[PDB]
Design a protein around this ligand. Structure first.
Ligand SMILES: O=C(c1ccc(F)nc1)N1CCC[C@H]1c1nc(Nc2cc(C3CC3)[nH]n2)c2cccn2n1
Length: 301
């Protein structure tokens, strides 16, 4: 297919500058755009591109995949701002998140270890604020009839002001490729982030997203260690399916671990919803959360 709509942006309104890094279809850049955020003449944006060698099938694929993001309008979900489908290079304009993916962010927080002072690990308040933002992006998606299937720190983005948001769907990368494993056929799956039921039948729901959310809290608490570190991909499958769980990270407040354990209930129906996760921590979120969140929006019921 490939049908241009109201998301179409004139190429002359875009300026690509520095590389952010490679995506599945090509290089992602930082840049500026005119008239993508209402009539703002200059908005710092992220620009997704298709490699110059790509085929017609590949460009149309990129446009249709990207286009799923058009439906969403949430402060805790990375925004699509525009599409450049007329002429080449094929572009998709998105909200810029200056601090990159949450897994790289958390790992950059680990001590350097060569005698210089270091910032103490994130406070429980800082962790709750990340949890609440992620959970809000996820509650908005669920209310919009979506099951994410790949919720993980590597798929959460960090803005200039440290706001965490659900990242652009299906971003491939290369850096976190070991976070995936194929037991079957077209089943290269994020096994260490999966619920016992999804590992059994390959079915994902809002409940299995809640399980992976608990894994994201553990990643936050461990500064993005590999979940089930001492185990091979095969051992993880058996260990999780048989009721095994991640250890309480060292120095992790019981309060944050209790929330992880709630997410990790063997029965999916016993796990809290994302609405329920937010309710339990709403008192702890920055006062601004009540004005920008899906949770506090008219759209929430
Ligand atoms: O880290 C990621 C990334 C993006 C989305 C996601 F869901 N998971 C990872 N990527 C993808 C390629 C470059 C690299 C990436 N992206 C950055 N910011 C982005 C990307 C986007 C939309 C265009 C994608 N908005 N802001 C960014 C800021 C600092 C370092 N990076 N690296």
């Amino acid at each position: 297919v490939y049908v241009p709509d109201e998301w179409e942006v004139a190429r002359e309104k875009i300026t690509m500058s520095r590389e952010l890094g490679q995506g599945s279809f090509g290089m992602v850049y930082e840049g500026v755009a005119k008239g993508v955020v209402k009539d703002e003449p200059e908005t710092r944006v992220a620009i997704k591109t298709v490699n110059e060698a790509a085929s017609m099938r590949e460009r149309i694929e990129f446009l249709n995949e990207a286009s799923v993001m058009k439906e969403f309008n949430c402060h805790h979900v990375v925004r699509l701002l525009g599409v450049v489908s007329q002429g080449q290079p094929t572009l998709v304009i998105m909200e810029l998140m200056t601090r990159g993916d949450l897994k790289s962010y958390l790992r950059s927080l680990r001590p350097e270890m060569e005698n210089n002072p270091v910032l103490a690990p994130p406070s429980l308040s800082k962790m709750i604020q990340m949890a609440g933002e992620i959970a809000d992006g996820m509650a908005y998606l669920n209310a919009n009839k979506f099951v994410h299937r790949d919720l993980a720190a590597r798929n959460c983005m960090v803005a200039e002001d440290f706001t965490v948001k659900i990242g652009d769907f299906g971003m491939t990368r290369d850096i976190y490729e070991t976070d995936y494993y194929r037991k079957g056929g077209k089943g290269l799956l994020p096994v260490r982030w999966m619920s016992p039921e999804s590992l059994k039948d390959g079915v994902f729901t809002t409940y299995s997203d809640v399980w992976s959310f608990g894994v994201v809290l553990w990643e936050i608490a461990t500064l993005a260690e590999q979940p089930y570190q001492g185990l091979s991909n095969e051992q993880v499958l058996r260990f999780v399916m048989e009721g095994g769980l991640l250890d309480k990270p060292d120095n992790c407040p019981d309060m944050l671990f209790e929330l992880m354990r709630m997410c990790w209930q063997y029965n999916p129906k016993m796990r809290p919803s994302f609405l329920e996760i937010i309710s339990s921590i709403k008192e702890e979120m920055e006062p601004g959360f009540r004005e920008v969140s899906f949770y506090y929006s008219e759209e929430n019921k």
